Structures are given as structure tokens and as C-alpha cells.
DNA sequence: ATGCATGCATGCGCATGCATGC
DNA sequence: GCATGCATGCGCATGCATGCAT
């Protein structure tokens, strides 16, 4: 099944669906979530009468299915020399790390901490299994909590562009069934189907959720299951089944009030669960200062995107050529190196020691 | 075709013949017989399978393996019938008791997964691996039909039962009658069946995709060999011709295909428990077994294996029963690593029921009579607490819980049992188990200045019923905290995908397992040597002293929880009576768990107070380390209040130290600045300036 | 799938624990062709076993007589009342009055008097309530023990529904319906629900529950003696 | 004579309205 | 002042039983 693209959509429209049917080899791609140009035919199927000396419906036969926009030594081979040539003259430059900053979020101004979180959730870590059983997290989720109209919601659309597999909600607009999954009948067997949700969809990427505080509590439950767990378990219609959802999640959310209480801690200022705020890595906290310098440089920045519409970006990488980038890195597997084991002890006991009396009272326990 | 060339009598004799000379004259690497062995010990069991190695076939007669993936329904009748011939030949009386004898391959070259099955594996013996997900149970099939004429009374032949289609008779030879008919099934045979749904296993699925399902046949032996969740490996045949496969009432002309599957592949010890009941430090080596990837929390570890162990339930007559488990409830801050306590009892226990109060958990906590999602069945299913019948029941969340659960939890614990009233069912169940809790305070963080009743959301009775509770504090100590932090780092390194303790050697899982499982089954201690003087008086004193303190008095339920902690100390030596040493032991631990809950300046008192039954075993060391870091937080405190940030370097003069070790009536310490716990905690000592430095 | 005929009808309520003797049958009505949605169940016929068998898990009266004619039946009894707890003498003798209960009366006018006896119990923890409790639950011919709040699966008073499917009028018994002519012990007797605690006022004066709704008025009858323990 | 459309539960998914508890 | 627990209507699909039009 296909679905019509929101670039197509005319005034006040739903997207139209279509059914489409691979033959022999073709059968083995068009994998759930793709966005998939196919080549084929429009043949009639029955679904006035006739009489001797008639209701029909539309399906769609294709004969090859490719990508609308197209093992590391597969990748290797796979890319050509100028691509090769492009990746390797990325690889070695340290400016990467700040170039990216500003290829990704080009408009938005300062919260470099932010885009610097956003690139390490990306990038994410190396997931392991234990010898007892048990299961060690690789990935990264992040959360951000900030006064009205601070860019909080820019990231997250952002995310939603540069990612290729990325699935995006808000508040209440999600049902239950709308994530985890759904179960129907085959329709020409014996056999069911799996319905994929939100989660599913955006498997090894990026689940962005704005308003996070707007979702019920069975909702936010579901989501803790999923994020500690990750695996999704459907006992429903006889069928009973487990699915694996390796997600990293980017959640926006808002002060009780409306505006950040500079004197409480975070956990007085969220009405978020415990157990869902000790599963997130990182919390950012913005907020607006009464600044006349920082208000000129913002009003400067958004002059300038509003006078020049496309003439205001001078992005040092393509988008396409940090997805590559990106598709090649995340094959990586370091390891860990001995004298990191003891610079690492050294600076949890740092941090640790920093939480003494001596100081103010943080906001956040270590 | 192979099946064409399979089907005429000629090669069929002639393959039979051969496989009866492979059976007869097959022999193993050292050169006895495989074959007589196995068939003999078939018979030792009444069995009615036989397995047979594809490798040993390929390498005797060649033309059989190559043969065998392409036809495999009359090659295999043909096996099975010189395999019946050849054990008939060698007993005669199976005649009577098994007239077949199925033969089973083993080894496969290994084959693809679920997703490649295709159009070229029609009719073909396949290879796969999954998990299994549902379960039909045990059915009967009909195998030689006799029928039963309507008019006369005339019972026909039998009829083969194909897989394919149903039986047909044709007519009455007698009445040449040709209408309804009966099953006889006073003279019928019958066929055990089965079917299940496999799913691929989720690690081995990539990403981007979902995993398939097929569904597969077991019959005869095969039937229940698998349980739900589990992982297997079978052998089949990929299947199509059986009648209604085709879609033909509607939609496109799809065929269904199902799997029909032929194998499945997933004294002395008594005498060693009692020589290591005779080792004089067993059960020091028993509670540093508990928990192994767990660092620190001795104390719990020791509490956990008395309830593990547990005691001896008594009822005199039939009117005052009293209780031999132990729960444990443990209350601590978050980080201290309460989960993994659960998990590992989890893992070790043999009947264990683990559930969380959040919400979503796989097993309820109260009884509800329901049609199955799955199965479809109009079934009773039971709580955690019922299921947990005789076992362990871990509760993670204990303070997220509501009514329901809260009300089944308090009549489980203080009558033992459950009663249901529902959709017309009237029902009393047995709901004796061990319950094992875990919670974290009200306010995020423990406070000493309050009770621990005024630290959990949990309500007074609730939390009478338990008789340990376990409090864990998240205090910054900078050598445990890189202690731990080392841990994990080289817990974290160890398992990339490419002996801390004073004691002698912990012991090995299973070792502990049996251990466990003979102490429960063969030994029941017996109180005839208790001495009531010591207890009465010890019980006299706690409530004058708690009275005189005037808060929580003691009350006699603590003694008999004493006592229950007694029988399980004598559980681990296997004593068949108790003596002073569990005693003392069981006295130190209710004291300990009886203080802890006080609050500041009364468990201080009391700590004071009562510091001879607490320091029973214990070591001087441990008191004298406890000193020095009291003096050394209270230095540290004092030099962050004043001066504003931490020195480089701690110093304590001793003269203190020996004060209080004269006030705890401890004059030598010599041995304690030669202790390992004092090179253990990086602490020195320098006479040239009589202090103590860190 | 259990068949019972001729006189095993009503034998067994839902619920028991039973061990029945029978026959291991299968269904026969004829033939038919497959059907539904699968179809991959070749002649597989539906199993039921026929039941044959079910068990379920004057000179005494001369005794009784002579047990009661003693002039110390008093003070027996009252022994025999919990004698491994220590003390409680008056508690003991109060518990066998309430167990052996009083008569009721009706009237020419029509009403009924109570002739059941309630007591309360108050104290702090650890003064041996709930065993008083359980031994009275054991002792009584018909007892039920409650913990106020009601229980696992079965509230405290009844309840009364209609079934969409069929139009019946399905009460659910409650601990207080359950017992008639017994004894009903209440642990935690401060944390009942307002609907229960409105209940019970009646429950204890006119020994009868009253409910009313759409299109039906029913007066269920509860006469039960009631011995509650609470907390300070 | 035979295969199919329909009557009668029942699960599924959902939205909507009334009561209450913090 | 609002989110949630507890009925109840709405719309639907699915399974089991049977009764006869082509
Ligand atoms: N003593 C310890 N030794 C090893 N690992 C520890 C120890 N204490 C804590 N941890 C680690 O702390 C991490 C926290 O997760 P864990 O599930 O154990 O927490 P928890 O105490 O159950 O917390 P919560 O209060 O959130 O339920 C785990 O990965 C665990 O390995
Ligand atoms: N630091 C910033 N730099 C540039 N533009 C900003 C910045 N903060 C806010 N803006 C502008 O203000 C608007 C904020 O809207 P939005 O991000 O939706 O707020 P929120 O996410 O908090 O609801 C954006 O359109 C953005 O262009
Ligand atoms: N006077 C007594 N004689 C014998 N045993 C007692 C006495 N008082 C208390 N106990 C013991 O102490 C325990 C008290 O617990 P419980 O009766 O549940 O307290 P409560 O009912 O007040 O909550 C019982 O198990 C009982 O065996
Ligand atoms: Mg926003
Ligand atoms: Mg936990
Ligand atoms: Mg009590
Ligand atoms: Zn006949």
C-alpha cells in the first residue's frame, strides 16, 4: 500500500492510497516507511451487467522500485570516487565538529549546546549485551524545557528535515494504538499483519515529541516501556508477537507555569513522572534574558532571513553529503582505552565531589 | 521428476534393501555399532522415534541424500518401514505394543531463514529457525476409520486418513447403500496433533523491516516439545497440496503455505552437600554468593538469603496457624541498584513471579475470569500472588500501586489466601509465597530526621506484615564512589562485542541451586534447646528502654520473626536443632532492622544503648574504620563550611581514635593499622607525628 | 467440556474443586465440509468426556445433651476458645455469646427485631486482634473475614446489573449477602468506601439491603453478626 | 442437490457523556 | 477548573449456527 505525498496535496485534501503489486525479485524491496518511486502499468481488477446473445476497481502492477532520493567495506564499494573523495576530505578536518553546527542550524543563533547535544544523539553510541542476559542502552535521548518562543520548536522541525527516518507528534494528536503497533488479517490468507506505529517507523532514528507534558499517563507509560525495555509486545486477535524498537527520542516541553522558576529545581518545575525524567541522558534549560544586545543580534538574524530568502545561508556542507557521512559513521564500533578508564574514574569523582554543601544547591543530582 | 522415479516398486525395494544393510552395518568412528546401541536404548524407554544423521547417510550411500530433499514423503515411509523391519527383526514382541516407528533426521545443511522461503522450496525439506508463539495443545485425529452403515450394521474397512482431504467412503458392499454414515469410535484410531505460529527471532531481524510468521504441524511424539517463547529448530516440508489452500471464493488465485515439521532441536551430589556443610565458613561463602555483579550491600545479601532459605510454617491443631516466610521490602534512594537485586533472585529462584505496581506488567495482581486474546478460551486466570503458590514474588514500584492491588496484597499476606466472587464463581485459593518489594521514598531522597513510616507513601499494617526492611542511603563517599565507578567501567569494557570480598571462593550457581533445593527438602530444624531466660530478659529490656525513649515500642511479632530467622540460620548448616550461635545471629539481625527505622537522636540511643547483642561476629576492625570516617567527614565538613572548597590532603590525630576505642573498651590497634581495610580505604599512619593521614 | 445427565444435574456449583469419573468421548453429528476462515484442520473432530461420577472435595445428639447439662459448660466453652492466645478471659466469653448469638422476634404489626449480636474491638498493634478474628471465621459453621475495603475480586456489599445481551437481572454476592445466620469479621473497619459505610448502617439496623433501579426494586436479606477490629 | 447469505453473539476500536477528586 | 473513572451509544469486523434458491 502507498500513500499519496503532502507535496501533491491540493487545497483542503487527504491524501489519496493506492495499491501496488511486486512480482518475483521486486517482491524483496518497498519496505514499510519508504519514500519510493515505482515503475509499472494501471490495470483494472473487478471487484451495468452482463448477459448472452460489471464493478472494477484500480490496482497498480510496478516493475522496479527505487529510491526518490538516493559492512563498511560494502559501503565503501558501494560509493564512487568523488563521494569516497568528499567523505575522506570531511574525516579529516576538526572543524567538523563545529562546521556541522553551523550546516544544520544555520538561521538559528548562539544555543550552541543545544546543536552540540542534538549531533551527539545523532551520532549516538555503541549498544552491548551482558553475559548474565541483561541488556546495556546505546542510545541517546534528549530533552528540552525552555520560556516561550525560544527557538524550542525549531529543532525538532529541523531534525525532521535533515533525518531521513523520522517520526514527529504532538500532545494528544496520538492515540495509543496511533503508537506501538496494530494488528490486522491478511486479507487473500490465514496469516495477520502488523500496522506499524510512530516508534516502529522511526526504528534506529529519531522520534521528535513537542508538548510533551500534554500526553496522558497511559501514553507517557507506553513511551517509559518502550524507551527502557525497547521492545514492543502485542498479545491481540490470537496473534501474540515482539517487535524490536531501537529509538532515540527528542522531547520539547514547558514550565508548569508557563515561565521557568529560577529559585525551585527542575523536578518542582516539570510535571514529568520520575522514572520517565531518570531515563533521558540530557536536559536543556533555556531561558530568555533581558538583554538589549542579545535582542539586537536576534532581530538582526531574523531581518536577514526575511530580506534574503536563499541568498542568507553559505552552508560549508550539502545535506546529502552529511547523511553520508552519518551513514558511514554510525557503522563504527570503538573501543575503550585503559588510561579512559582511569581518566573517566577521576572525573565522576569529580562531579560526584561537586555536589558537596560547600556550594548552592543544584538543580539536577549527579 | 525424483518423486516419479521414487514412486515405481523396483527402486523402492531396491532402497529398501539398501537402507536395511545401512542400518544393519553402520558403525561409529571407533567402530561400534550406532545403531544397535540406539535401538536398545529406545526399547529401554518404549519409544516409538528414531533419529538418523544426515551427514553418516551422505557418507554411506550417497544416492539416499541426494535423493531426500526432493522427495521426501516416500522416501521417509520407505525408512520408517525398514526401520520397522529391522526392529522387528531384532525383538518380535513390539508386534503388541508399537506397530510404526517413524524416523527422524537430525543434522541439515542449514537452510535459509523465514524470509526466503519462496516458490523454489515447493515440495521440498527445508531447515529454519524461530521462535514459537502459540500453542493449539494436544489433539486427536482420526487414522484408519472404520464407519458404522445407517441401515444395516455392516462396519467398513478401514480408511487411510490423508493430511490432504477428508475421507470419502463410497458404499455398503453388503446393502450397496450409499448414504450418511457413523464413525465408529469404539474401533477407530487415533493421532495426537498439534500446530504452532513461529516468529523469526528479533535480534536477528534488521532494521527497517518486521519479522515473519508460519505456522507448522507436529504429530504423534512431536507434540508437546515446545513451549511458548521459546527457540527451536525444525526440519519440514514445505507444503501446499491440502484442500482449501487455493483462494477461490474471491481476490487473486494465492495459494497458503504450511510446514509440516519432522524434528525438533532446542547421589553424588547429596554427598557433596554434606561435605561442604562441614566447611567452617559455609555460610559466609553463601551470603558472598548472592549477587555477584552486585558490589557492597552485605547486609542485604545476607537478608535476602534468609528469606531464601526461609523457615518452618506451624499450626497447633487446627485453630492458630502461623507463617514460615519471610518477606523483605526494601526502601531506597534512586541509583542504588534495587532492580537487579529482584533480577537476580528472579533468575535463581525456581518458582519466581516478577511484577511491577506502574502498570502494563505481563502477570496481574488480581484475578480475573476472561476469554483469552489469544487462545480464545473463556479461562479464570489468577493473580501473581496464586501463581506464586509455594514460590517468590518480586514487586518493583511498591508505591505506585492502587486500591485493587493494595487490598489483594494486604488478605494475601495476613490471611494467605485469595477469595474471588465473580460471574457467578465462588472461589477460596492458596497464596502462600514469599513476597520480595522495592520502593523509593516520598520526597526522592530519605530522611533521617523522620520515621521510615513517614518516608513511604505505604500505610502502617502494610508494612507490619514484613519482617525485613532494608533502608539505602546515596551518601558521597569518594572511595566507594571510585570503587564503583571502576566496577562499572570494567563491567562496561569486559563485554565489547569484539574475589573483592573477605571471602575464601563464592560458590558456582547451579552448586548453590542444589544446595538450596536439598536444604528445603531435608531438613526441618527443631527449637528443644532454646534458651527462654535470655530472650525473656532481652525482651524486657527493648520495650523499658523504647519506652523510656518513647517512640515505636517493640512488640512480640519481632520475636517470632527472631525465631523464624533462627530456623532459617540452621537451614544453612543443615543442624537439625538450633543452637546459640543462629540465635544470637537472628537477635543481631531484628535489632539492626528494629534501629534502622528510628529516627536520629533515638536511633542513636538505641545504637548506644544496645552495642553489645550488635556486635556478635562482627569484626573490631569494622567499628574502628567507622570511627575514623566519622572523624574524617566531620574534618572534611568542617574545612569545606570554612574554608570554602577541600584541601589536598586529610589529617586526624590518633589520640582521638583511642578515646573512643576506650569508650567502646578497645585499647590495641595495632592489628587494625596492620588490617587490610585500612590499606583498602588509602588511610596511613605516621608515628613520627602520631596521626593518621588520607 | 463436561457432560452431566439424569440425576448428576445440580450436583456441582461453579466454583468447587471436583474429581469426576467418566468417559472420553468425541462429538458425532454427522459431516460437514470445513469452514471459516482456516481451513488447514483435516478430520479433527471436537472432544468431551460423559460424566459418570463426581466427588467433590442420632447418637450425637445425646452427647450435645450431655455436654450442656454440666453445670461448667460456661467455662468450658470459654476455654475452649483460642487457648493458645494468653489472657482475654471476658474477650473469650464475649466471642462464644456472639458465636452461640440470640433469637429473633417478629411481630403482629409485621416488623422484625434484631437477634444478632455486633461488638468493635479497639487497640494498639499487637494486642492478637486478627486471630481472634480468624478463629471465629474457622469456628462458625458459615464466616467470612473481610478487610473493609472489601477483598481481591469480591466487594463488600452485593451489586446488581442487567445483562445487554440477554435482559437478566445478575446480582453479584457480596461479603455481607454471602453470610446469613453467620459471622462477619471486619479488619481495618476505618478505611471503608462511603457507598459500603452507607450500607452497612442499614445492614446492621434492619438486617436487609435495599437497591432500586431502572425497572427494578429488590430487598435482599443480610442477617449477619458483625465483629469489626480497628485502630486508634 | 449443494454451496452461500443471513441471523445472532462477541471482540475491537472509538467517541461521548456523567461523576469526582485534587 | 480540569483530567479521569465508569457507563453507554456508534460503527465495525469476526466467528458460529442453519436454512434453502439456483
Ligand atoms: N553497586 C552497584 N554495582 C554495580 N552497578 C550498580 C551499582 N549500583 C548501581 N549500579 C548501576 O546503576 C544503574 C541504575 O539502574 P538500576 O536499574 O540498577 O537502578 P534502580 O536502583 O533500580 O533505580 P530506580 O530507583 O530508578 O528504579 C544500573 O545500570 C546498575 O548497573
Ligand atoms: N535564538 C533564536 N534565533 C533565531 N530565531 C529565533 C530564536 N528564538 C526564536 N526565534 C524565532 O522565533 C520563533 C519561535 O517560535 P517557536 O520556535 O515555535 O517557539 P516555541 O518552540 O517555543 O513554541 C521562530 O520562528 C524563530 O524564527
Ligand atoms: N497475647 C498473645 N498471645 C499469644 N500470641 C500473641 C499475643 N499477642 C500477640 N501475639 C502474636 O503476635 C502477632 C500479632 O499480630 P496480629 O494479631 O496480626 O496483630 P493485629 O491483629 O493487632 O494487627 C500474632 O501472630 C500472635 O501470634
Ligand atoms: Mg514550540
Ligand atoms: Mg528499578
Ligand atoms: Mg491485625
Ligand atoms: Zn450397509
Known sequence: RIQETQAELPRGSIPRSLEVILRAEAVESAQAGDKCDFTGTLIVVPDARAETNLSYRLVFLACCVAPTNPTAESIKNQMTVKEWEKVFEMSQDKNLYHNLCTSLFPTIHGNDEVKRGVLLMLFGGVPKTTGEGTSLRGDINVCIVGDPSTAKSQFLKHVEEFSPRAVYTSGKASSAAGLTAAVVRDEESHEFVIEAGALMLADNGVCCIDEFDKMDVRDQVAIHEAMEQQTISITKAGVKATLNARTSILAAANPISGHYDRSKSLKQNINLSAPIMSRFDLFFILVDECNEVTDYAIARRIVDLHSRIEESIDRVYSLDDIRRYLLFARQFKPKISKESEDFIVEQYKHLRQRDGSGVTKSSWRI | SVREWVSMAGPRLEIHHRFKNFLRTHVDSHGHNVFKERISDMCKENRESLVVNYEDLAAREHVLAYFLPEAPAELLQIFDEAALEVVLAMYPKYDRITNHIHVRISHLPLVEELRSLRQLHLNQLIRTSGVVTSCTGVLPQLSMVKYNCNKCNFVLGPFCQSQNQEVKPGSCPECQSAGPFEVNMEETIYQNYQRIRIQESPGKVAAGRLPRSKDAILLADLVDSCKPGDEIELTGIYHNNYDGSLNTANGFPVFATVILANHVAKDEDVKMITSLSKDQQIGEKIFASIAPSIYGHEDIKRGLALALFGGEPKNPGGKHKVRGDINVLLCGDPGTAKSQFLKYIEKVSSRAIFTTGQGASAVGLT???????????????????????????????????????????????????????????????????????????????????????????????????????????????????????????????????????????????????????????????????????????????????????????????????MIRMAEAHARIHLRDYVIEDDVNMAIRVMLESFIDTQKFSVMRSMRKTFARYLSFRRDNNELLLFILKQLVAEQVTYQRNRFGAQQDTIEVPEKDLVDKARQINIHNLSAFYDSELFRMNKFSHDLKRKMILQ | QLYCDRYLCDKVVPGNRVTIM?????????????????????????????????????????????????????????????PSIFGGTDMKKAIACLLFGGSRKRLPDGLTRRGDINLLMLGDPGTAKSQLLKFVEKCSPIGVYTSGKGSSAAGLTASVMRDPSSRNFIMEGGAMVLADGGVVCIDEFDKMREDDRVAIHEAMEQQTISIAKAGITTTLNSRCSVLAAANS
Open chain 2, 367 to 561: 484475578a480475573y475470569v476472561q476469554r483469552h486474546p489469544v487462545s480464545r478460551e473463556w479461562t479464570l486466570e489468577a493473580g501473581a500472588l496464586v501463581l506464586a503458590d509455594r514460590g517468590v514474588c518480586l514487586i518493583d514500584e511498591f508505591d505506585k500501586m492502587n486500591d485493587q492491588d493494595r487490598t489483594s496484597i494486604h488478605e494475601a499476606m495476613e490471611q494467605q489466601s485469595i477469595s474471588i466472587s465473580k460471574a457467578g464463581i465462588v472461589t477460596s485459593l492458596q497464596a502462600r509465597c514469599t513476597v520480595i518489594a522495592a520502593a523509593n521514598p516520598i520526597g526522592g531522597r530519605y530522611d533521617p530526621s523522620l520515621t521510615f513510616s513517614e518516608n513511604v507513601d505505604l500505610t502502617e499494617p502494610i508494612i507490619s506484615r514484613f519482617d525485613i526492611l532494608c533502608v539505602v542511603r546515596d551518601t558521597v563517599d569518594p572511595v566507594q564512589d571510585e570503587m564503583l565507578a571502576r566496577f562499572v567501567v570494567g563491567s562496561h569494557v569486559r563485554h565489547h562485542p569484539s574475589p573483592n570480598t573477605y571471602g575464601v571462593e563464592p560458590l558456582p550457581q547451579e552448586v548453590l541451586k542444589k544446595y538450596i533445593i536439598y536444604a528445603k527438602e531435608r531438613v526441618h530444624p527443631k527449637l528443644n534447646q532454646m534458651d527462654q531466660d535470655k530472650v525473656a530478659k532481652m525482651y524486657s529490656d527493648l520495650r523499658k528502654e523504647s519506652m523510656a525513649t518513647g517512640s515505636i515500642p517493640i512488640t512480640v511479632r519481632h520475636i517470632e520473626s
Open chain 3, 22 to 82: 467418566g468417559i472420553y468421548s468425541i462429538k458425532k453429528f454427522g459431516l460437514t465440509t470445513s469452514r471459516g476462515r482456516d481451513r488447514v484442520g483435516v478430520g479433527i473432530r471436537s472432544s468431551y468426556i460423559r460424566v459418570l461420577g463426581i466427588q467433590v472435595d442420632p447418637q450425637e445428639e445425646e452427647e450435645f445433651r450431655r455436654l450442656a447439662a454440666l453445670p461448667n459448660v460456661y467455662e468450658v466453652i470459654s476455654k475452649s476458645i483460642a
